[PDB]
Nucleic acid binder design. Structure first.
Lengths: 249, 93, 131, 53, 279
RNA sequence: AAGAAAUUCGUAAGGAGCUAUAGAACUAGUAAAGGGAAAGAUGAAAGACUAAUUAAAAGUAAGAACAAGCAAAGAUUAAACCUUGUACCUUUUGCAUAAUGAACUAACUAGAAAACUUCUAACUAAAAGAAUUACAGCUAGAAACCCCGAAACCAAAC
RNA sequence: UGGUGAUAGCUGGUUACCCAAAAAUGAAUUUAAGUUCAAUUUUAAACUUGCUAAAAAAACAAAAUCAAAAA
């Protein structure tokens, strides 16, 4: 660093010596003299994740491959930005990276492409779709604040009748999907590509990959209606029978 | 015009007084204090402009909101009339 | 805070003016500029007058000896004499004997020039007409 | 300059001064004053040579 | 009240300028004034003249009787310039006479004495010293330096110069600095001649030449209030000198003056004296 | 032009002001409702005779004028003579022998905003100290648009 | 008395220096003092021929419109 050596040779700097960078500040005109003298909401605003964008996160180790993909974890890693003021209502995927993302992992995304669904399943990944209420999703993205507010964990909402067919559809692999068709559906997709179907049971970590929360359950770890002792780093569970009726309701 | 016929007395100023010497200290409270306190929080002055800046109309409007109930009746009426002129100048010219 | 000295700048040039002009800045400033401009215009015209004065003095000196100014100049030109008009005035004033010699030289060339013109160049060039 | 012109007496007086200044005195009694405020070496050298001539 | 100290300071300078113009200060010698070093100035003075001077001798030449009295008075509560003064004045008289004789052998011995006295005149010596800053270098008890005291030093410096540089350089110095003062000076201006007609006749009889017969060469405006008369001195019927005059007497007197210049070889067209010679 | 909310979020003596035409109208609301001024200056001591300070505004005096002339310029030995020259601002048109305005002195007396862009930098598939944008973007800084003046109109007192 | 620094496409005024560049055509507008459209000017960027000139050839009838090569 020859620049540093020049500083030693140069005289000690003072407050007055400081000077603004060249061209940083423009000149101004003032009237001192003659110079200035004389004279749509209903449609969900899906926020997608590109397959190429998905690929680098796994390759860079930003998201642990062993841990199932969680949208909250992506927010924790600053992978995606969700603004409640924007009233983002959904999540999607982008066709970009279809040719550059060869990997298998369990994941849940609100909306997924049918071609993408089978391709990751062909690789061995597990993909499903869940419905998060836009207000609930904002709560999900920021779980700590409502604990600060003191609010208790509410039951996850269900899709409106317009979106019920999508989630209930077996091919869409939604949480409302019929399990009976899943073994047949998995078989059908394998034939379409022709790849040899790997049964989810064969995987050693099958239970971890296939683990899913209840439709009313917002969080994998936390059941609906739960409370968290944030100050004491503990979880509080309601013990009132009437409260169970509220959760059932 | 005409000018003074007497010279003013000489004056000496100390540039290393505590105020000048300690000017700017703790200005890095946020970065050096874990950002618990923002430097904007260190501003002391009129309530309506602590940590906030705006044009003359915005400053006047904010001033009215902050101390409107605690302002004098005569001052409030004068402020209302003054706001009208400021609003028209900026928003119509 | 220097407005007084700005007026002094106009006043110092206007100290020698007469009337309310010398004491009124409104008029003093106008007079000062007018005075300066007048000198600027005269500079170019000043040189022309000096040449006119020199030529006029030469003619009187030549006429004193009986020689016209145009005739004297032409004959000197024919002799490849390049003395300037200013020097010519000095020679007459301070070297009257030399001026007569110059007068005699010009007249002799004029006589030779008239003979040469009448001769049409057939005759040999004169001694004073030889180059 | 001093070696070149030893017939001129040169006084150099570093002192607390707002503006540096040069004073030239001539045999006939003429004295000329020139302010040296914020002038480079090259400019100063040219000015001194003019004063000497 | 206008604020600021610069404006107040500026006006104080403005007041000082007006006061100085109204009441200019009395003169003071440069020795008393600041930035004066006698030793340094003398060394520069000698180098400035491109001449070699003995520092001790030059200081003695500058030393004057009046200066010693002031120092002695202070001492009560040293070599004068008289010895050097005599040498320079005496040497200058010989050198000045020698220069005059060579150029004007015809000029009479009486005229040379007048010319020598004029060149050694107090006014001429004083003027040279002041223009050379010698007055500041002169040592005296009074400023402005009295002229007779200043005149003494100048010849004393010449005496010191003679010892330091010899007659040859001093002779060149006299020619370079003193003989130059004769430029533009007419003969009668430097030498007073009364009764030119009688003097002209006296020279002619000495040369055994007939006295010229005055004649009126030209006449103009005789009866007017502005008459012009030209009178020519005719020796053996030959004109020797002619002069213009408002009256015949004036023309004759002027013609006599012209003849005297011709007699002593002081013609307006005479060969100029030469200062270029390094020898 | 007006303009919410839902939903999030919120503990706690000084002046890069004026200094007697400036700053409150003010030394003062003093000298029908109502309107509303002007001004003062010594020194430590006046139980030291009340201070000085300034070629300092215009105005005058000391010291009126001398054929010829936008008043000056070129000059010069010389103030005037000789030579040259159709007052100024604004406005007409790039023209006035048009037309407006000026007794003079001092003070006072009119250009103010960032939506976007360029420029100057920080960090960068990320950038901004919460609310913002993004397939090189994002953040910060700098960069801008006067004064006085009607006939009128209305409310409430007298 | 206050609203009130009313409003006025109108009248008038609006304070230091230097360098550089720089022209009252077509269309419309309660528009002809302004503004939009074309044209100009102007800055940045892309990359290559441009201006004057210009024969024959037509067009006309039996040095300009056009624009080969040049210079």
């Amino acid at each position: 660093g020859t620049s540093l050596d020049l500083l030693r040779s140069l005289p000690r700097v003072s407050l007055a010596n400081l000077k603004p960078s060249p061209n940083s500040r423009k000149r101004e005109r003032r009237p001192r003299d003659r110079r200035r003298g004389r004279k749509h909401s209903f449609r969900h605003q899906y926020q997608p994740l590109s397959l190429r964008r998905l690929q680098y996160l796994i390759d860079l180790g930003r998201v642990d491959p062993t841990q199932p993909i969680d949208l909250t974890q992506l927010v924790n890693g600053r992978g995606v930005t969700i603004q409640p003021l924007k009233r983002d209502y959904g999540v999607q995927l982008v066709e970009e990276g279809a040719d550059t993302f060869q990997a298998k992992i369990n994941i849940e995304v609100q909306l997924a492409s049918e071609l993408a669904i089978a391709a990751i399943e062909k690789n061995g990944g597990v993909v499903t779709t869940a419905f998060y209420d836009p207000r609930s999703l904002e709560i999900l993205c920021k779980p700590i604040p409502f604990f600060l507010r003191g609010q208790p964990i509410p039951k996850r909402m269900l899709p409106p009748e317009s979106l019920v067919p999508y989630y209930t559809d077996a091919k869409n692999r939604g949480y409302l999907a019929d399990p009976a068709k899943f073994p047949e559906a998995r078989l059908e997709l394998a034939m379409k590509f022709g790849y040899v179907l790997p049964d989810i049971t064969k995987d050693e970590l099958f239970r971890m990959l296939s683990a899913r929360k209840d439709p009313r359950q917002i969080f994998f770890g936390l059941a609906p209606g739960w409370v968290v002792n944030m100050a004491d780093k503990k979880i509080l569970k309601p013990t009132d029978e009437n409260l169970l009726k509220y959760y059932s309701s | 015009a005409f000018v003074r016929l007497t010279l003013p007395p000489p004056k000496v100023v100390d540039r290393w007084n505590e105020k000048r010497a300690l000017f700017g200290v703790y200005d890095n409270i946020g970065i050096l204090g874990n950002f618990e306190k923002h430097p904007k929080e260190l501003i002391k002055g009129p309530v309506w402009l602590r940590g906030w800046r705006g044009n003359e109309l915005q400053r006047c409007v904010r001033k009215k909101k902050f101390v409107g109930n605690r302002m004098f009746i005569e001052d409030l009426h004068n402020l209302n009339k003054r706001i009208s002129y400021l609003y028209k100048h900026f928003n119509r010219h | 805070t220097d407005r007084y000295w700005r007026v002094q700048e106009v006043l110092k040039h206007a100290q020698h003016f007469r009337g309310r002009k010398n004491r009124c800045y409104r008029l003093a400033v106008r007079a000062v500029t007018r005075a300066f401009v007048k000198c600027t215009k005269a500079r170019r015209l000043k040189k022309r007058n000096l040449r006119t004065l020199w030529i006029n003095r030469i003619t009187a000196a030549s006429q004193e000896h009986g020689l016209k100014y145009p005739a004297f100049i032409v004959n000197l030109i024919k002799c490849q004499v390049e003395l300037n008009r200013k020097v010519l005035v000095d020679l007459a004033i301070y070297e009257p004997k030399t001026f007569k010699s110059l007068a005699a030289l010009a007249k002799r060339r004029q006589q030779e020039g008239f003979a040469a013109a009448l001769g049409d160049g057939k005759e040999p060039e004169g001694i004073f007409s030889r180059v | 300059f001093a070696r070149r012109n030893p017939g001129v007496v040169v006084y150099v007086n570093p002192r607390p001064c707002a503006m540096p200044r040069i004073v030239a005195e001539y045999l006939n009694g003429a004295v000329r004053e020139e302010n040296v405020n914020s002038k480079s070496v090259e400019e100063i050298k040219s000015l001194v040579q003019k004063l000497a001539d | 009240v206008k604020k600021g100290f610069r404006a107040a300071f500026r006006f104080q300078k403005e007041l000082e300028r007006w006061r100085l113009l109204r009441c200019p200060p009395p003169p003071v010698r440069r020795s008393e004034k600041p930035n004066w070093d006698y030793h340094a100035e003398v060394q520069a003075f000698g180098s400035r003249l491109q001449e070699t001077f003995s520092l001790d001798l030059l200081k003695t030449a500058f030393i004057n009787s009046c200066y010693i009295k002031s120092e002695e008075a202070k001492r009560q509560s040293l070599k004068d310039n008289q010895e050097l003064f005599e040498q320079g004045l005496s040497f200058s008289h010989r050198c000045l006479t020698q220069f005059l004789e060579d150029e004007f052998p015809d000029l009479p011995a009486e005229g040379t004495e007048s010319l020598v006295s004029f060149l050694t005149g107090e006014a001429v010596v004083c003027h040279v010293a002041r223009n050379l800053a010698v007055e500041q270098l002169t040592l005296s008890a009074e400023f402005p330096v009295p002229l007779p005291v200043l005149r003494q030093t100048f010849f004393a410096v010449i005496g010191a110069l003679l010892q330091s540089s010899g007659p040859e350089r001093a002779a060149l110095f006299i020619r370079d600095f003193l003989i130059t003062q004769m430029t533009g000076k007419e003969l009668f201006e430097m030498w007073t001649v009364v009764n030119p007609m009688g003097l002209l006749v006296e020279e002619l009889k000495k040369r055994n030449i007939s006295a010229p017969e005055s004649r009126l060469t030209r006449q103009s405006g005789s009866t007017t209030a502005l008459p012009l008369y030209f009178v020519g001195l005719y020796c053996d019927r030959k004109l020797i000198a002619e002069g213009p005059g408002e009256t015949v007497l004036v023309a004759e007197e002027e013609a006599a003056r012209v003849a005297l210049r011709k007699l002593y070889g002081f013609t307006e067209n005479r060969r100029p004296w030469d200062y270029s010679k390094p020898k």
